[PDB]
Design a binder for this molecule. Structure first.
Ligand SMILES: COc1nccnc1CC(C)C
Length: 149
């Protein structure tokens, strides 16, 4: 009834560690598209990220493992789930484990373009909360996004 597959833009991101989300850090992500293939139990993700100031396109394949949990390799291991959805937004949560074993909790509010409504935003905060991340580690990331469409 509400196809989650489509164009998605990163509006906000929660994070247990502000350094992982900083300018050029591995988590300053900017989504572009998300293909869910419930058939093969996977998920295609096309998204940009900066390094030294230049954009980098990434097209990752997520694997659906037992539960609402998908798997993807990037910056270390990653585990995420759509903690919630509405027609207008997509709030994700991902447990990253870095190439040094550091644990990090993030929340990511996804939507179609710049128009986020208070309902979804209020929701995201709640889930960031429920995930144990400071309400204060959320930051606007779309304004940063200078990567290609
Ligand atoms: C490719 O996407 C991902 N890969 C690993 C973990 N989380 C995501 C979701 C984004 C929106 C932060």
């Amino acid at each position: 009834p509400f196809e989650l597959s489509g164009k998605w833009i990163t509006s906000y991101i929660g994070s247990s560690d502000l350094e992982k989300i900083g300018e050029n850090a591995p988590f300053q992500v900017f989504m572009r598209s998300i293909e869910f293939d419930d058939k093969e139990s996977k998920v295609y993700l096309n998204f940009f990220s900066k390094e030294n100031g230049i954009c980098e396109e990434f097209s990752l394949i997520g694997t659906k493992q037992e539960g609402n949990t998908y798997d993807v390799n990037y910056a270390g291991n990653n585990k995420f789930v759509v903690s919630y959805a509405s027609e207008t937004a997509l709030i994700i949560s991902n447990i990253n484990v870095d190439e040094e074993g550091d644990k990090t909790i993030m929340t990511g509010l996804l939507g179609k373009g710049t128009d986020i409504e208070d309902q979804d935003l209020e929701k995201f905060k709640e889930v960031t909360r429920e995930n144990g991340i400071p309400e204060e580690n959320i930051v606007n990331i779309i304004e940063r996004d200078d990567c290609p469409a």
